[PDB]
Design a protein around this ligand. Structure first.
Ligand SMILES: C#Cc1cccc(S(N)(=O)=O)c1
Ligand SMILES: [N-]=[N+]=NCC(=O)NCCS
Ligand SMILES: [N-]=[N+]=NCC(=O)NCCS
Ligand SMILES: [Zn+2]
Length: 257
C-alpha cells in the first residue's frame, strides 16, 4: 500500500486517498480525564480469553499482528458499552522511537511509550469484512504501555520478533495466552471511533483501559529492531507507527469508574 508513517505518506497525507480521515468519528483522540464523565449505564466489562487460540504472528510492514482463530466464540469481549458478542481476531501494537511517544490515544495530552490494540468483531455480522462496514462492527480494547518492570506475558512475543524482522515474514505463534497482557484493573474510557490506519473506517467502539501495563526497556527496544521494509531492501526501522490524536468533534468520552 501507498500510505505509511513517513513525511511523504504519513497521517497528514492519508486524507487524499481516504477522505474519511477528516470525518466525524476518527481515532485516536486525546482523553481529557476532567471532562470524561462517569456513566452508570455501562454494564460490567467481560474479557473472556480462557479459550483463546493464537495461530501466527505477521510483520505486515507497519506493525506486527498476532492472529487468532475466530471461527468460533473462543476469545470474546462483551459487556461494558457493548451489546452482543465480539470475537478476538488479532492484536498489535503502536510504538515510538523514544519512550516519550508511541501511543495513539493520549491521556490529558500524555503520550505513552506504546499502545496495545486487541481487535474484536461483532458476531452479528458474520465475518470481519462485513463487520467493518457497520458503525458497531468492531470493539478495540486499547492498553497503554509504560517503561518500567518487564511484563512476563509479553516475553514470548518479544522473543519471536527475531524471526519476523521484515515485511511479509510470519511465524507460528500457537498457544499464546493474551490474558498475560492485561493490567489488574478493567477501569476504562469508551467512545465511538475508527480504525487508526487506512481505510480509517468509522466502525469501532473504543474501550481504553486506564491502567497501563509496564514493560521493560529491553522489551520495547526489541520492538524497535523490527523493519518496515522487506528483506533485501534498505533498512527502515519500524518505529513511530502511530497516528496522532484527531478532533473529538461531537463525541463524549464516558468513564466506567
Ligand atoms: C484488523 C484490524 C485493524 C486494522 C486497522 C487498524 C486497526 S486499529 N489500529 O486497532 O484501529 C485494526
Ligand atoms: N503481508 N505483508 N504486507 C502486505 C501488505 O501490503 N498488505 C496490504 C493489504 S493489501
Ligand atoms: N520499506 N517500507 N517502508 C515504506 C512504508 O512507508 N511502509 C508502510 C509502513 S505502514
Ligand atoms: Zn492499532
Amino acid at each position: 500500500h501507498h500510505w505509511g508513517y513517513g513525511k511523504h505518506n504519513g497521517p497528514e497525507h492519508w486524507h487524499k486517498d481516504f477522505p474519511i480521515a477528516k470525518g466525524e468519528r476518527q481515532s485516536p483522540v486525546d482523553i481529557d480525564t476532567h471532562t470524561a464523565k462517569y456513566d452508570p449505564s455501562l454494564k460490567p466489562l467481560s474479557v473472556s480469553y480462557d479459550q483463546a487460540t493464537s495461530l501466527r504472528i505477521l510483520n505486515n510492514g507497519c506493525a506486527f499482528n498476532v492472529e487468532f482463530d475466530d471461527s468460533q466464540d473462543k476469545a470474546v469481549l462483551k459487556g461494558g458499552p457493548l451489546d452482543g458478542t465480539y470475537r478476538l481476531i488479532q492484536f498489535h501494537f503502536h510504538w515510538g522511537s523514544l519512550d516519550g511517544q508511541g501511543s495513539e490515544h493520549t491521556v490529558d495530552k500524555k503520550k505513552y511509550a506504546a499502545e496495545l490494540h486487541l481487535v474484536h468483531w461483532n458476531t452479528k455480522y458474520g465475518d470481519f469484512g462485513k463487520a467493518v462496514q457497520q458503525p458497531d462492527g468492531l470493539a478495540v480494547l486499547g492498553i497503554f504501555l509504560k517503561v518500567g518492570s518487564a511484563k512476563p506475558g509479553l516475553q514470548k512475543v518479544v522473543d519471536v520478533l527475531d524471526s519476523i524482522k521484515t515485511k511479509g515474514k510470519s511465524a507460528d505463534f500457537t498457544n499464546f495466552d493474551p490474558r498475560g497482557l492485561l493490567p489488574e484493573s478493567l477501569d476504562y474510557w469508551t467512545y465511538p471511533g475508527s480504525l487508526t490506519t487506512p481505510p480509517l473506517l468509522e466502525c469501532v467502539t473504543w474501550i481504553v483501559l486506564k491502567e497501563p501495563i509496564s514493560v521493560s526497556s529491553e522489551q520495547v527496544l526489541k520492538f524497535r529492531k523490527l523493519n518496515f521494509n522487506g528483506e533485501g531492501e534498505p533498512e527502515e526501522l519500524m518505529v513511530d507507527n502511530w497516528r496522532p490524536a484527531q478532533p473529538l468533534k461531537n463525541r463524549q468520552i464516558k468513564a466506567s469508574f
